[PDB]
Design a protein around this ligand. Structure first.
Ligand SMILES: CC(C)(C)C[C@@H]1N[C@@H](C(=O)NCC[C@H](O)CO)[C@H](c2cccc(Cl)c2F)[C@@]1(C#N)c1ccc(Cl)cc1F
Length: 83
Protein backbone atom coordinates (compact mmCIF):
# COMPACT_ATOMS: atom_id res chain seq x y z
CA UNK A 1 0.00 0.00 0.00
CA UNK A 2 1.54 3.24 -1.24
CA UNK A 3 1.93 6.40 0.86
CA UNK A 4 0.86 9.80 -0.39
CA UNK A 5 2.96 12.55 1.19
CA UNK A 6 1.26 15.76 2.24
CA UNK A 7 2.26 18.79 0.08
CA UNK A 8 4.69 19.75 2.83
CA UNK A 9 6.44 16.42 3.02
CA UNK A 10 6.28 16.27 -0.79
CA UNK A 11 8.09 19.54 -1.50
CA UNK A 12 10.93 18.19 0.61
CA UNK A 13 11.02 14.88 -1.26
CA UNK A 14 10.74 16.64 -4.58
CA UNK A 15 13.65 18.91 -3.66
CA UNK A 16 15.36 15.68 -2.58
CA UNK A 17 15.00 14.16 -6.04
CA UNK A 18 11.63 12.38 -5.92
CA UNK A 19 9.73 12.74 -9.18
CA UNK A 20 6.24 11.54 -8.20
CA UNK A 21 3.30 11.90 -5.82
CA UNK A 22 2.90 8.43 -4.28
CA UNK A 23 5.52 6.12 -2.87
CA UNK A 24 6.41 3.02 -0.93
CA UNK A 25 7.47 3.87 2.62
CA UNK A 26 10.96 2.75 1.67
CA UNK A 27 10.91 5.35 -1.10
CA UNK A 28 9.99 8.14 1.31
CA UNK A 29 12.74 6.96 3.67
CA UNK A 30 15.16 6.91 0.75
CA UNK A 31 14.56 10.47 -0.46
CA UNK A 32 14.32 11.90 3.09
CA UNK A 33 17.59 10.18 3.89
CA UNK A 34 18.84 11.89 0.73
CA UNK A 35 17.37 15.20 1.85
CA UNK A 36 19.20 14.84 5.13
CA UNK A 37 22.47 14.22 3.31
CA UNK A 38 21.94 17.28 1.13
CA UNK A 39 21.18 19.64 4.05
CA UNK A 40 24.12 18.08 5.92
CA UNK A 41 21.76 17.60 8.89
CA UNK A 42 23.58 14.42 9.88
CA UNK A 43 26.67 14.07 12.02
CA UNK A 44 27.97 10.55 11.70
CA UNK A 45 30.77 11.73 13.99
CA UNK A 46 28.58 12.83 16.91
CA UNK A 47 26.27 9.93 17.68
CA UNK A 48 24.25 9.32 14.51
CA UNK A 49 21.81 12.16 15.22
CA UNK A 50 20.11 14.23 12.56
CA UNK A 51 20.02 17.91 13.52
CA UNK A 52 17.11 19.89 12.23
CA UNK A 53 16.57 22.73 14.70
CA UNK A 54 16.78 25.08 11.73
CA UNK A 55 15.59 23.03 8.75
CA UNK A 56 12.04 22.64 7.36
CA UNK A 57 12.44 18.99 8.35
CA UNK A 58 12.65 19.65 12.07
CA UNK A 59 9.55 21.79 11.74
CA UNK A 60 7.81 19.01 9.82
CA UNK A 61 8.67 16.34 12.44
CA UNK A 62 8.06 18.71 15.32
CA UNK A 63 11.51 17.84 16.64
CA UNK A 64 14.92 19.42 17.06
CA UNK A 65 16.96 16.28 16.62
CA UNK A 66 16.69 12.51 16.40
CA UNK A 67 18.98 9.49 16.15
CA UNK A 68 18.91 7.70 12.82
CA UNK A 69 18.44 4.51 14.82
CA UNK A 70 15.20 5.42 16.56
CA UNK A 71 13.32 3.96 13.58
CA UNK A 72 10.06 3.56 15.44
CA UNK A 73 10.11 7.32 16.11
CA UNK A 74 11.25 8.17 12.58
CA UNK A 75 8.26 6.20 11.29
CA UNK A 76 5.72 7.99 13.43
CA UNK A 77 7.16 11.38 12.51
CA UNK A 78 6.68 10.49 8.90
CA UNK A 79 3.26 8.94 9.40
CA UNK A 80 1.68 12.22 10.43
CA UNK A 81 2.83 13.68 7.13
CA UNK A 82 1.21 11.15 4.82
CA UNK A 83 -2.29 11.86 3.51
C1 LIG B 1 21.99 8.61 4.97
C2 LIG B 1 21.14 8.45 6.24
C3 LIG B 1 20.48 9.78 6.60
C4 LIG B 1 22.03 7.98 7.40
C5 LIG B 1 20.04 7.41 5.98
C6 LIG B 1 19.57 6.79 7.29
N1 LIG B 1 20.36 5.55 7.62
C7 LIG B 1 19.38 4.51 8.07
C8 LIG B 1 19.85 3.86 9.32
O1 LIG B 1 19.20 3.01 9.95
N2 LIG B 1 21.10 4.20 9.73
C9 LIG B 1 21.80 3.50 10.80
C10 LIG B 1 23.26 3.34 10.40
C11 LIG B 1 24.10 2.88 11.58
O2 LIG B 1 25.48 3.20 11.36
C12 LIG B 1 23.91 1.38 11.83
O3 LIG B 1 24.37 0.62 10.71
C13 LIG B 1 18.08 5.27 8.28
C14 LIG B 1 16.88 4.39 8.21
C15 LIG B 1 16.80 3.30 7.35
C16 LIG B 1 15.62 2.54 7.29
C17 LIG B 1 14.52 2.88 8.10
C18 LIG B 1 14.62 3.97 8.97
CL1 LIG B 1 13.27 4.48 9.97
C19 LIG B 1 15.80 4.66 9.02
F1 LIG B 1 15.91 5.62 9.95
C20 LIG B 1 18.14 6.33 7.19
C21 LIG B 1 17.95 5.73 5.86
N3 LIG B 1 17.81 5.27 4.82
C22 LIG B 1 17.15 7.45 7.37
C23 LIG B 1 16.31 7.80 6.32
C24 LIG B 1 15.33 8.78 6.51
C25 LIG B 1 15.21 9.40 7.76
CL2 LIG B 1 13.94 10.57 8.04
C26 LIG B 1 16.08 9.09 8.79
C27 LIG B 1 17.03 8.13 8.56
F2 LIG B 1 17.91 7.84 9.56
Amino acid sequence: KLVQPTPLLLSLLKSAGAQKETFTMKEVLYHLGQYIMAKQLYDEKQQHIVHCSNDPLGELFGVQEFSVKEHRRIYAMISRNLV
